[model samples]
Target: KVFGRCELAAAMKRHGLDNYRGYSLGNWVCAAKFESNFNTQATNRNTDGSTDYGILQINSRWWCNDGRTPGSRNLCNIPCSALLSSDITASVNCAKKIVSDGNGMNAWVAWRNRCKGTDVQAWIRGCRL
Candidate 1:
C-alpha cells in the first residue's frame, strides 16, 4: 500500500508511535517517508547480502528471518515477508523492538540522515492527532 502522508501518520498514531521513546510522531512519519515512501511492499537489498523490508524498512541482518542475511538475528522472530503486509502491525512491532534494543531510530540510516535533528512536524501537519 502506498500511503499518503496524513494517512500514514494516523496509522502510526493508532499503533502507539506518538511520543514513543522520545521520538515524536513526526519523526516516525518522516522516517517512513524517507525510508520507504510509505510503500508497504518496499524492499531494498543491501550490498552486504542483507535486505530491508516494508514501510519502516526493517533490516534482514538482524531484525527478520530473510534466510539470506547470513548471520541474521531474527530478533522479531518472524519472516521478513511479514513486514510487507499493508496492515503494518509487524513492521511497527519490529520497529519498536529495534528502538527498545538501544538502536533507537538510528537503526535506519534514512532516518538518521533525513529525519533526525530536523523539525519533522511538516510530515504530519494537519493530520488529526
Candidate 2:
C-alpha cells in the first residue's frame, strides 16, 4: 500500500509525538530512510553480530535486550511495536526522537543537507503534514 500524509500523521501521534508540522515530519522521513530504507520490519546484524531492529532500525543491544522479540524499554525507548502497528507517523516520529530527542527537525535539517537534493521526496514529499 502507498502511504500518504494523513496516515503518516496518525502514525506520529500514536507515539506521543506532537506538532509534527513544517519540517518536523520531513526530517523524520529523511532519517527513517537513512536508517532503515523505510522498511517497518527492517533489521540489521552488525559485523560484530550486534543487532539493529525495526523501521527506526534501533540497535537492540543499546535500546532493548531482546534477541528476537520487541525489546523496547518503553513507548519512548524505541516504539518498535508501534512502528509495526500501521502507525507510520508514530514510527517516524519515534525515530526522530531517538535521533534528536524531540528536536528532530534540527537533525532533519542535517539529514536534508546530506541527503535531500539527491532524494527530495525522502524529506519534502508529503511533508506538509
Candidate 3:
C-alpha cells in the first residue's frame, strides 16, 4: 500500500505533480483521498453499468477499456485492470491526459464534488508538497 496522506503527498511532489497542468497537488491529494483513500484497487460500479477505475476513479465509459464495456474510446490505451495497481505512475499519466482532454482536474467527479473551491491546503499539510 502507499501508506497514508503524508507519504502520498511526498510521492506526488517527487513526481512533479504539484506543477502538473498548473493544478495544485493539494487538489490531487484531496481527490485521491475522496475518490479512493489512496487505494489503487478502488473500483466503483455506477448505476449506469460503467465502472470507475483506480484512485482517480477513471471511468470505463470513456477512459479505459475494461472489456466489459463496449464503445469506449479508451483514450489512455491501457487496460482498466492496470489502473488497479499500487504503483501510481500509469494512473497519474492517464489522469494527466484526461485533464488535457479539456476537463482539467474536473475529470474526476470526486474532485469537482468535494475538492473544487474548497480549502484543501491541509490535504498536503506537513508533507512538503
Number of the top candidate by lDDT? 1
Candidate 2 TM-score to native: 0.53
How much is 57 displaced in model 1, in angstroms? 0.8
Would you list the C-alpha lDDT of every candidate in the order shown? Answer: 0.92, 0.51, 0.84
Give the range where candidate 1 is weakest over 10 consecutive residues by summed lDDT.
Answer: 99-108
* RMSD of each candidate relative to the true structure: 0.8, 5.5, 1.4
- Model 2 per-residue lDDT tens digits across residues 13-101: 45544444444444455555566666666667766555665555565544445445443344346434544444465455555545555
Structural similarity to truth (TM-score) of each candidate: 0.97, 0.53, 0.92
User: Under the 3 Å rule for N, CA and C atoms, how many clashes does model 2 have?
Assistant: 4
Which residue pairs clash within candidate 3?
Answer: none
- Among residues 3 or more apart in sequence or in different chains, the pairs in candidate 1 whose N, CA or C atoms overlap within 3 Å are none
Report backbone clashes per prediction: 0, 4, 0
lDDT of 1 by residue, 1-129 (tens): 999999888889999899889889999999999999999999999999999999999999998998888978999999999999989889998999998888788988999999999999889888777
Candidate with the larger TM-score of 2 and 3: 3
Best by TM-score: 1
